From a paper:
As discussed in Experimental procedures, careful purification of CtBP1 (28–375) in the presence of 5 mM AMP was required to completely remove bound NAD(H) that is apparently acquired during expression in E. coli. Eventual success became clear from crystallographic analysis showing the electron density for AMP but no observable density for the remainder of the NAD(H) cofactor. The cocrystal structure of AMP bound to CtBP1 (28–375) confirms that AMP binds nearly identically to the AMP portion of NADH. In particular, the adenosine phosphate maintains charge-stabilized hydrogen bonding with Arg 184, which then forms a hydrogen bond across the tetrameric interface with the main-chain carbonyl oxygen of Asp 209, which is nearly identical to that observed in CtBP1 and CtBP2 bound to NAD(H). Our finding that AMP triggers tetramer formation, but adenosine interferes with NADH-linked tetrameric assembly, demonstrates that this phosphate is critical for tetramer formation, apparently by localizing Arg 184 for favorable hydrogen bonding across the interface. The conformation of Trp 318 is essentially identical in CtBP1 bound to NAD+ and AMP lacking the nicotinamide moiety, arguing against the hypothesis that a direct interaction between the nicotinamide and Trp 318 is key for NAD(H) triggered assembly of CtBP. In the 120s hinge, Ser 124 contacts NADH and Ala 122 makes contacts in the tetrameric interface, and thus this hinge region is in a critical position to both sense binding in the coenzyme pocket and contribute to tetrameric assembly. Rather, our evidence indicates that it is the interaction of the adenosine phosphate with Arg 184/190 that is the key moiety triggering tetrameric assembly upon NAD(H) binding.
C-terminal binding proteins (CtBPs) are cotranscriptional factors that play key roles in cell fate. CtBP1 and CtBP2 regulate cellular processes through binding transcription factors and recruiting chromatin remodeling enzymes such as histone deacetylases, methyl transferases, and demethylases to targeted promoters. Our crystal structures of CtBP1 with AMP reveal participation of the adenosine phosphate in the tetrameric interface, pinpointing its central role in NAD(H)-linked assembly.
Residue numbers in the entry:
A (entry chain A), B (entry chain A): 26 to 357
């Protein structure tokens, strides 16, 4: 027989099968949890493809009796315990480049939607607001601000963060970034200003946008304490991970006006609902259903790449043949 | 007594009066038409301040018995018959620089809102759509496209058009422009590609954005004929003037899918209403209530400048003391 590969949290495998036809039997589970995965896959699955809707703990990982490779169809892999996965002898890889510029463009659109209130002006138009006089335009568009001279604070100057910084400079933004893992001099190469502490970033930025990965040290990076270190009436953008922000702390900040507005493509609990969660009655809120990454070309691009990574793992040597394995440190 | 200056289509004159206190008696009419302007102003008004909500024809102009200067608090002056105004000996000026980058930023936000469907994804979230699976994200975000490699066609490479072009290049856009009034070589200075005809612009652009002024030769520039010259599934953005687009021709294009989406901050008839007009049932439509220009700094900036232009006209020599008079050609 052929090695079994399973799409854990999905149903469509059309893009991947031309690549995996002669190398593995491909099945799907469409499961939000390992509860919903039939034991046939748990016992025989050699490879696994998954997105961001199912999380795998050590307990989940130990239920797979033959799994050897997990390929995350996407850039983020915070939903996988790569540390223990490596312990159990399971390599974990991702697809980091497919949606970089897509995410940066959706970030800039969210930033612009806060400064220009375009989305809010649109919603007010569908709700029947009549804007006839100049005074009424200033009123319903109240809060719209000039961008040139504003300081954009970038938290995490990675691949998406850099694309965000380059675009932000074209609008007159003065871009700052805080990245405690980058080597010395990265700011000189890109003509940006850097800060040492997260408090310095928040203290100087008129609008803060998150572009870091969710790791064991930055959970609730934006919390009730760090939120008090932001400028009065600042902006918050988050297309990275919902686990980075304490929504209850953010909710109160929006209600009291300490944060003038927030744009969020990710949330602590997804799918996101305006009726449930700490943001139920939070004002000045724009939210997208975790779609900052999605383009037709990016969706196909990352699915074909992940399929090839799976192929390399089955016909090559782990983890040397892999291209984007992220847990070679912990892989026994 | 002092020379009378009147804010025709407005009520607030706080910003302007510190500048005009010792030079003119300032009053307001809050009138949508010359019908609503009391004859006291029609007879004695020497200067006039107006926005874009009241239009002045030759008939309207001839009702002013002492008017000598009209200052449009804004960049556009298509709502004034400057030709006949000059005939009647009435100089007309504008404020062209206050909201250039504001308008370009709102343009880019509208462009990004079409490519990224951010505004539409937000509205769908408030309406209760549950986006839990990857397949559902591709579905509700259907239509979102990659920007790099896309060709943005700019119609009118003026002050706002240039700011739009510079920003568009930072996103990977390949920017084209059509401006039959610019001198030879303007494309070389800014590193852009130029086209001779409006049909060439529409034939090559994936997304067309209007940045021209409404003049006697470009009314309904986007009409049923020129609309058929655009690419299949193209984008339309308009933060210039609603009179440039034939909304009935655009309405059918959106319904048939010939245009995938349209973002409009101006309309043929304002204030805009989703229940009235040729766009009543037009799909894939984003609209803002003519607010692409507005910032707090731009609003104050253009009102103080216009007040100073009025001052220069009253204490100086017309039209030599004026800074931004646009009808010196026709001014007798
Ligand atoms: N807690 C944190 N604060 C700021 N930056 C971070 C943090 N954790 C990770 N990063 C950075 O975020 C960037 C992510 O890049 P990428 O993986 O290409 O999206 C890397 O440069 C990391 O060093
Ligand atoms: N019908 C038209 N088609 C294309 N460009 C135009 C048209 N009419 C005017 N323009 C240009 O639009 C620009 C407006 O610049 P500004 O007045 O600075 O916004 C000028 O460069 C004009 O030459
Ligand atoms: Ca501010
Ligand atoms: Ca297209
Ligand atoms: Cl402002
Ligand atoms: Cl796809
Ligand atoms: Cl695409
Ligand atoms: Cl104001």
């Amino acid at each position: 027989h052929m090695p079994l590969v399973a799409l854990l949290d999905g149903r469509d495998c059309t893009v991947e099968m031309p690549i995996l036809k002669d190398v593995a039997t491909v099945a799907f589970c469409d499961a939000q949890s390992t509860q919903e995965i039939h034991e046939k896959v748990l016992n025989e699955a050699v490879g696994a493809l998954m997105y961001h809707t199912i999380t795998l703990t050590r307990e989940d990982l130990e239920k797979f009796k033959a799994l050897r490779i997990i390929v995350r169809i996407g850039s983020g892999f915070d939903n996988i315990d790569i540390k223990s996965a490596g312990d159990l002898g399971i390599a974990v890889c991702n697809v980091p480049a497919a949606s970089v510029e897509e995410t940066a463009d959706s970030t800039l659109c969210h930033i612009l939607n806060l400064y220009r209130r375009a989305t809010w002006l649109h919603q007010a138009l569908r709700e029947g607001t009549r804007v006839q006089s100049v005074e009424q335009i200033r009123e319903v568009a109240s809060g719209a601000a000039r961008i040139r001279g504003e300081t954009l604070g970038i938290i995490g100057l990675g691949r998406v963060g850099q694309a965000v910084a380059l675009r932000a400079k074209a609008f007159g933004f003065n871009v700052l970034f805080y990245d405690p893992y980058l080597s010395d001099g990265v700011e000189r190469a890109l003509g940006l200003q850097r800060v040492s502490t997260l408090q310095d970033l928040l203290f100087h930025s008129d609008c803060v946008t998150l572009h870091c990965g969710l790791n064991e040290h930055n959970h609730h990076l934006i919390n009730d304490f760090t939120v008090k270190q932001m400028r009065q009436g600042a902006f918050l953008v988050n297309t990275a991970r919902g686990g980075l922000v304490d929504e209850k702390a953010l909710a109160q900040a929006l209600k009291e006006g300490r944060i003038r507005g927030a744009a969020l493509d990710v949330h602590e609990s997804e799918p996101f609902s305006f009726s449930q969660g700490p943001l139920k009655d939070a004002p000045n809120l724009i939210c997208t259903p975790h779609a900052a990454w999605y383009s037709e070309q990016a969706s196909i691009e990352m699915r074909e790449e992940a399929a090839r990574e799976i192929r390399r793992a089955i016909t090559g040597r782990i983890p040397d043949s892999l291209k984007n394995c992220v847990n070679k440190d912990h892989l026994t």
